[PDB]
Amino acid sequence: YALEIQMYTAQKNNKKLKALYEQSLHIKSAIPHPLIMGVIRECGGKMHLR
Amino acid sequence: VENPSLDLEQYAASYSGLMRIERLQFIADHCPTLRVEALKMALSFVQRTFNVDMYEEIHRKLSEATRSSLRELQNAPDAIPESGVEPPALDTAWVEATRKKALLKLEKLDTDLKNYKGNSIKESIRRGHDDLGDHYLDCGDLSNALKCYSRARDYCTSAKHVINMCLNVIKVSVYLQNWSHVLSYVSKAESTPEIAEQRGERDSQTQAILTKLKCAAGLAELAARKYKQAAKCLLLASFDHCDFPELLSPSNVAIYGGLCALATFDRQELQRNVISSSSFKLFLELEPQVRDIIFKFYESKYASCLKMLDEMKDNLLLDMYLAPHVRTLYTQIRNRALIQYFSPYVSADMHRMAAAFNTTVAALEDELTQLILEGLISARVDSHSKILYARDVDQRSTTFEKSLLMGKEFQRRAKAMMLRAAVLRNQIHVKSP
Amino acid sequence: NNPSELRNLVNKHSETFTRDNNMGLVKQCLSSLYKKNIQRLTKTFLTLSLQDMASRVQLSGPQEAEKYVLHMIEDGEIFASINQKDGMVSFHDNPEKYNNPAMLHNIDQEMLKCIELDERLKAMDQEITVNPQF
Amino acid sequence: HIEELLRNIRTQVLIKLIKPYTRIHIPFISKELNIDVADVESLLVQCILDNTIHGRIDQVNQLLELDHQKRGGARYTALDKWTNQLNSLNQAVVSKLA
C-alpha cells in the first residue's frame, strides 16, 4: 500500500490516493509500531488538507 | 433558439437502448441545426436493439426535413446518387422483419418460462420473468415489461433478488412516466439489505447499490420540483456506479446537483453539502463550468457567474428532464442573488449593482421594487442620485401598530358576535313568507 | 393592479350597475386603485420622480402626480413632501415612534373599552347560567 | 496554502480591531492590513454573509456601519408572537357560535 501511494503521489491523481488511504486504515489495528504507519499517514494528511 | 455548443456525440454515446432514442428526438425537436445529425445517430441506434416504431417516426421527421424548400436539405447534395452519406428511405422488409423476430423471440422466452414454472424452482421462474421483461423493452412495448417484473416479486428469497427486481422495475417506470413508483421501490430496496448495510460490506462493496438508488430518487424529485430535496438526495451519489446508460449519465448528475442546489440553498447549506463533500467533488471536477458557477455565485462574483450562466442556458434547455426547470431555477438564483447582494450593504451604489447583475440601472430598479414589496429586502431607493439606502426596521413600530390594530378588529368581531347572538336568541332569520 | 383594465370593465358591466343602483360607488373603487398604486410606491422608494410616478401609475402627467399626493396629505393617507426644485417626491413615513406619552394615553383609552366589553359578556354569560342548560 | 494563511491572519486581526468602533473606514483598515481597498471590500462582503463581521457597508461614503445598534429586541419579538396568536384565537372563538 505504501509503494503504491509512493507511485500515486508522483503520478498525481488525488482520487485514488484518498481510496488507498481508507482501505489501508482497516489493517492498522493489529499492527504494532512500525515506520510504514507514518509513511501512509503522510499522504493522508496532505489529502485532508486539500 | 439555437446553440450548437452542446456536444451531440457525448450525449448519444453516454446512453443506450430506449433512453438514447427518446432523448435524441427531444434535442432534434428544440434545436434547428443539431436535428439532422441527431436523426442519423438515432437511426443507426434504432437499426440495432430491434424496435419498429421509432424507425417509422424518426424517418418521418427526416422526410420532412429533406423534402421541403423551407429547409436547406433538398438542395444540399444537389442530386441523389449513391455515396455513403445519402438520406436513407424506408425498407419495406426491415420493418416487418423486426416485428416478426421480436414476436418470435417472445415465444421462445415464454416456452422457457413454462418449464421453469413446471420445475417449480423459484429463482429459475424469477430469471424467466426478467428475460420476458427485458425483451419487451428492446421490442418497444413499455407496458408489458412492468407486468413481467411484478410477477417476479413473489419468488424472492434474498435481499439481492429484491434489489435486482426494484432496479429493473425502475427501468420500466421511467417509460410509463410516473416518478412516485421510483420512490416506493428505491426506499424498499434501500431498507431490504440491512438499511444499506452496517459495515460497508466489509472493506468496500464491489458495485454500489446505494449510489444507484439515491441518483434515481434525485431525478424523481428534480422533476417533482422538490428541488432542495433533489440536490440533497443526489449529491450523495458517487462515481461508484461509474455510469448509468438506462437512467442518468454521469455528466447530468453534476449539472443537476449543482444548479438545483444553488437556487434554493442558503450559505450554510452550500458550504456543508456541495463544497466540503468528497463525493460531489469527482462531479465538480468532471466539468469545470458547473463548479466555477457555484464559487462565483458564493464569492459575490455575480457578474462572472451570470455571464457563464447565460451561455450554458440553451444547452441545458435541450436536455429532456432538465428543460422546464431552467427558467424556474435561473429566476430563483437571481432573486436570491438580489437579497444576497443587499445583506452586506446598508447603502449600495446602483450602477455597481446593475453592472454586477448585467442589466441596465433602469431594469434593475424595476426588479428591486418587486423585491421590496413581495420579498423581504427592507431597503429604499433614492432614485434622484441613484443610491440604494438603508431602511432600518424597528421591531417596536411593527409590534405596537399591530397590537393596536389587532385590538380594534378584536373588539369589532365581539360587537358583531353580540348582534349574531341577538337575532338567534329571539329567533328571527330571513324568510320569504 | 391596472386601472386601464378596471375602467374598461366598468363600461362592459354598466347596466348591472345601474339597475342595482350602486352607481357612483363603482367609480370610487377606481379612484381607490389609483391611491393604492401611488401608496405601494412609498413602501418601495425614498425618493422618486413625478415623471416616473406618472408613467408607472398611468396618471400621465406629472402635474397630476403632485395633485394626487396633495389631496392625500390633507386626508392623511400619506406622509410625504414634494420637491419642486428637483422634480421629486420625497416620502417620509413617521407618524409614531411609539415612545410618546400620546401613544400611552391612546393604549390606556383602548383598555377602558375592553374592560367594558368584557362586562357586557359577563352579564350575558351569567344570564345563560340562570337559564337551565339543555 | 500560504495565500490562505495571509488571509487567515488578516481576517482574525480584523475581528479584534472592529470592536472599539461602530463606524470604521475602509481605507483605514486597508492601510492597517497592508493591502489595497478593493481586496478588503471583497473580504468584508464575504465576512458579513459568513457573519464573522457584524454590520453593513456604506459604499457612498466608504464606512462600515457595524452593528452595535442592538438595544433589547427580545421583549419586542415575544410580544409580536403573542400578538399574532390572539388574532387567530379571537377568529377561532367567535366562529364557533352557530
Q: Which burial class, exposed, middle or buried, applies to C13 when counting CB atoms under 10 A from its CB (0-12, 13-18, 19+)?
A: exposed
Q: How many degrees, rounded to 5, is the angle at CA B262 between CA B257 and CA B263?
A: 110
C-alpha cell of residue D51: 457573519
CA dist B361 and B383 (Å) reads 10
Q: Does D74 reach chain B within 8 Å, measured CB to CB?
A: no
Neighbours of C134 (CB within 10 A): 3
C-alpha cell of residue C96: 409614531
CA dist B248 and B257 (Å) reads 12
- Nearest CB neighbour to A26, from listed B203, B278, B282: B203
Q: Which burial class, exposed, middle or buried, applies to C12 when counting CB atoms under 10 A from its CB (0-12, 13-18, 19+)?
A: exposed
CA dist A14 and A9 (Å) reads 8
Q: How many degrees, rounded to 5, is the angle at CA C76 between CA C4 and CA B381?
A: 65
B interface mutation test: which of C41, C42, C92, C98 has the most B CBs within 10 A?
Answer: C98
Largest CA distance in chain B: 100
Q: Which residues in chain C have their CB less than 8 angstroms from residue B368's CB? A: 44
Chains that touch B (3 or more CB pairs under 8 A): A, C, D
Q: Does D20 reach chain B within 8 Å, measured CB to CB?
A: no
Q: Which burial class, exposed, middle or buried, applies to B185 when counting CB atoms under 10 A from its CB (0-12, 13-18, 19+)?
A: buried
Resolution of the solved structure (Å): 8.2
Q: Does B16 reach chain D within 8 Å, measured CB to CB?
A: no
Dihedral sign computed on CA atoms, order B11, B17, B18, B21:
positive
C-alpha cell of residue D94: 367567535
Minimal Cα distance from B270: which residue of D?
A: D50
For helices B17-30 and B35-47, the axis angle rounded to 10 degrees is: 160
Q: Does D69 reach chain B within 8 Å, measured CB to CB?
A: yes
φ, ψ for residue B386 (rounded to 5)?
Answer: 55, 60
Q: How many residues does chain D have?
A: 98
CA dist C112 and B214 (Å) reads 63
